[PDB]
Write a protein that binds this ligand. Structure first.
Ligand code: FES
Ligand SMILES: [Mg+2]
Length: 202
């Protein structure tokens, strides 16, 4: 379908109660999915469950870098009844390693997701993405922010939908130069999607 934003599909990720039940039962604030294509891993994250902070809006660092309307988004609002659910690509934009967002860590210098800071550290070359600052790079070699998956919460049903991205994912074999290039099939994208709940302490 093209019922998402600017030519993207509208894809149901999960119901809010699936996310909340997982957080209550396991403590795991990360929820993996694939979008817009089956081989493109992403994750939802409840930034308040993760950090203890009421994070309800983060910047779009790619404003004006791509055509509108996706390029015209200034900020990304958190979704659901608490306003705190966001989503990102799970593919590092340095060299395409899959990011271990499920490995919850207590130091900034450990690969994984540093919960207190909402910082996602790639094991391959040490890129660190500041999720609560819109995925911007705060350390390491990644040349641009981690792409955000734009979400829409259906208040009638509780369902959380993925509806676009603010940027192209990592370019592996096929160049991706616009968000909508995420709709291109690249056989080099062979990444799996972790089972939920996936979190571990690392
Ligand atoms: S592939 Fe992630 S830091 Fe290089
Ligand atoms: Mg930090």
């Amino acid at each position: 379908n093209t019922d998402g934003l600017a030519g993207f599909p509208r894809y149901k990720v999960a119901n809010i109660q699936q996310v909340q039940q997982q957080i209550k039962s396991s403590g795991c604030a990360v929820y993996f999915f694939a979008y817009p294509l089956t081989d493109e891993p992403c994750f939802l994250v409840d930034l308040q469950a993760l950090t203890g902070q009421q994070i309800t809006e983060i910047p779009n660092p790619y404003y004006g870098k791509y055509a509108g309307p996706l390029g015209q988004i200034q900020t990304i609002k958190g979704v659901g009844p608490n306003g705190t659910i966001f989503a990102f690509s799970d593919v590092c934009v340095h060299l395409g390693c899959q990011l271990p967002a499920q490995v919850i860590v207590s130091s900034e210098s450990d690969p994984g997701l540093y919960a207190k800071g909402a910082d996602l550290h790639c094991p391959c070359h040490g890129s660190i993405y500041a999720l609560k600052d819109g995925g911007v790079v705060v350390s390491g070699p990644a040349p641009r922010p981690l792409p955000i998956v734009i979400l829409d919460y259906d208040s009638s049903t509780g369902d959380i939908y993925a509806v676009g991205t603010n940027a192209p994912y990592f370019s592996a074999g096929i160049p991706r130069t616009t968000p909508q290039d995420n709709l291109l099939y690249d056989p080099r994208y062979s990444y799996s999607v972790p089972n939920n709940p996936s979190c571990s302490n690392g």
